[PDB]
Design a protein around this ligand. Structure first.
Ligand SMILES: NCC(=O)CCC(=O)O
Length: 487
């Protein structure tokens, strides 16, 4: 028994190990969202401002493609833990790779430093993200009802790190000390790794020390050749295009765009064509197709707050917060703190609205439709402000109001999708259903990598109105099938 080897109390009424992983996940998410908040400005700011001087659209595309690959890397990363290392080994290995990637950005390696950093953080996040979360659930016995509250505490560390790191790193953006700020994130991640190394054995015991489905001798040869050949094809294609001077980021963004649209098709088709899925379960998988489209439309607009809305605010607004006499300069990195702050303050509030309803509360489709409509309206709001003011500089309050309307939509959509990924999941395809709910974000980010290229031809203001309209009309179309989709 893995439960007999660990403490069952010790961290606010939950296993002591939830305390070790809260500290690790806080420091890892602190360094991730800190690095991310700075990265967009580090890329497109001029060389004389200590940036890389990359074209605005290419910097926006790198941000969205980087985010897509982090979520896609969870899929092979969960597999490596399930079949090769176990969840403990993948977490430790993944954490070490994330540290290397942050150190890559602290060094004066310009573009080599940027892409080698992304490479290490993509692989490391894939190995750490799904497996640290798996260990949290395995700390609880089969019939223990504390598990849901345990994850509510676990995901507080995620939003706490996301809130605090842009506030701390705004100083490094202001003085243009990008390397200094990226070293702070590397030191932040090092605290999380040292804490795991000091307290993982006595608090996590034997949980996750070995893979659940180990590979047989023949499978090590089979999967080794297939993976070996895929890693060999990617290396040569990138090397031949580099030395012939025909390698651009368009190669990476187009490959990831294909993966973003191909992966959801492969997963849905497998679950529908399987013989280990009942007629009742097959109808729920069919009913999650329009919900997947709504989730994708939601995450498309929400994730654009890290590379489109913030640059627009920095370039077109006054960047002067002004609320009931409280006026101060609004730092560009602090746009990334609005979303995690409102989740911390209003996630338990919206949770009590549904708990004081029970049967009165709306369906999964109505919650997914409310969320996508609010995300669509947030882009209509800022688009109409740009259209109304034109060349005139408007208040940063309008940009903040856009982020606030989008986070309110996330409070309706994000928890519903987590519950849908487990309730609508077939008995044999639980891990595959967690991948489709995860892919609503990855697919949206893969589309965003190419969707940002429409900003120059359409214009930044029309781009916001077009996306917001597309999101609302498709939501209202899917909303006419709300009684049908409820199965
Ligand atoms: N759970 C993490 C978030 O939702 C925050 C992301 C953001 O800074 O926009």
């Amino acid at each position: 028994q893995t439960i007999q080897s660990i403490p069952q109390k010790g961290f606010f009424g939950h296993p002591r190990g939830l305390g070790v992983l809260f500290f690790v996940e806080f420091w890892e998410r602190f360094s991730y969202y800190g690095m991310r908040a700075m990265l967009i400005f580090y890329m497109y700011f001029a060389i004389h401002q200590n940036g890389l001087g990359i074209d605005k659209t290419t910097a926006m595309s790198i941000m969205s493609v980087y985010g897509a690959l982090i979520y896609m890397s969870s899929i092979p990363g969960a597999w490596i833990a399930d079949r090769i290392t176990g969840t403990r080994g993948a977490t430790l290995l993944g954490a070490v790779l994330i540290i290397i990637g942050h150190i890559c950005l602290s060094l004066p390696f310009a573009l080599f430093g940027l892409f080698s950093s992304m490479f290490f953080i993509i692989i490391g996040s894939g190995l750490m993200k799904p497996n640290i979360s798996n260990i949290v659930g395995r700390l609880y016995p089969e019939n223990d009802t504390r598990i849901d509250a345990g994850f509510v505490i676990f995901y507080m560390s995620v939003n706490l790190g996301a809130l605090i790191s842009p506030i701390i790193l705004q100083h490094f953006v202001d003085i243009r000390n990008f390397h200094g700020g990226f070293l702070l994130a590397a030191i932040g991640m090092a605290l999380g790794l040292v804490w795991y190394l000091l307290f993982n054995r006595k608090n996590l015991g034997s949980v996750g020390m070995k893979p659940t489905n180990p590979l047989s001798k023949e499978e090590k040869r089979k999967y080794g050749m297939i993976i070996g050949i895929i890693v060999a094809i990617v290396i040569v294609v990138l090397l031949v295009t580099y030395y012939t001077h025909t390698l651009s980021f368009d190669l990476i963004s187009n490959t990831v765009l294909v993966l973003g649209v191909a992966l959801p098709i492969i997963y849905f088709t497998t679950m529908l064509r399987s013989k280990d899925v009942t007629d009742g379960e097959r109808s729920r998988v069919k009913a999650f197709i329009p919900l997947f489209i709504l989730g994708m439309l939601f995450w498309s607009i929400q994730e654009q707050g890290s590379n489109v809305l913030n640059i627009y605010g920095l370039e077109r607004s006054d960047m002067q917060l002004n609320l009931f006499g409280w006026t101060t300069r609004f730092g560009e990195a602090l746009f990334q703190s609005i979303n995690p702050l409102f989740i911390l303050l209003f996630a338990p509030v919206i949770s009590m609205i549904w708990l004081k309803m029970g049967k009165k509360q709306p369906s999964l489709a109505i919650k997914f439709s409310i969320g996508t409509l609010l995300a669509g309206l947030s882009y209509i709001l800022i688009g109409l402000v740009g259209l109304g003011y034109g060349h005139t500089q408007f208040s940063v309050n309008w940009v903040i109001l856009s982020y606030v309307i989008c986070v309110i939509g996330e409070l309706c959509l994000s928890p519903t999708g987590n519950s849908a990924a487990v309730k609508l999941a077939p008995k044999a395809f639980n891990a595959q259903m967690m991948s489709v709910w995860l892919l609503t974000n990855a697919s949206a980010q893969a589309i965003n990598g190419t969707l940002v290229k429409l900003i120059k031809p359409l214009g930044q203001t029309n781009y916001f109105i077009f996306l917001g309209t597309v999101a609302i009309v498709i939501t209202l179309i899917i909303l006419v099938f709300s009684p049908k989709i409820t199965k």
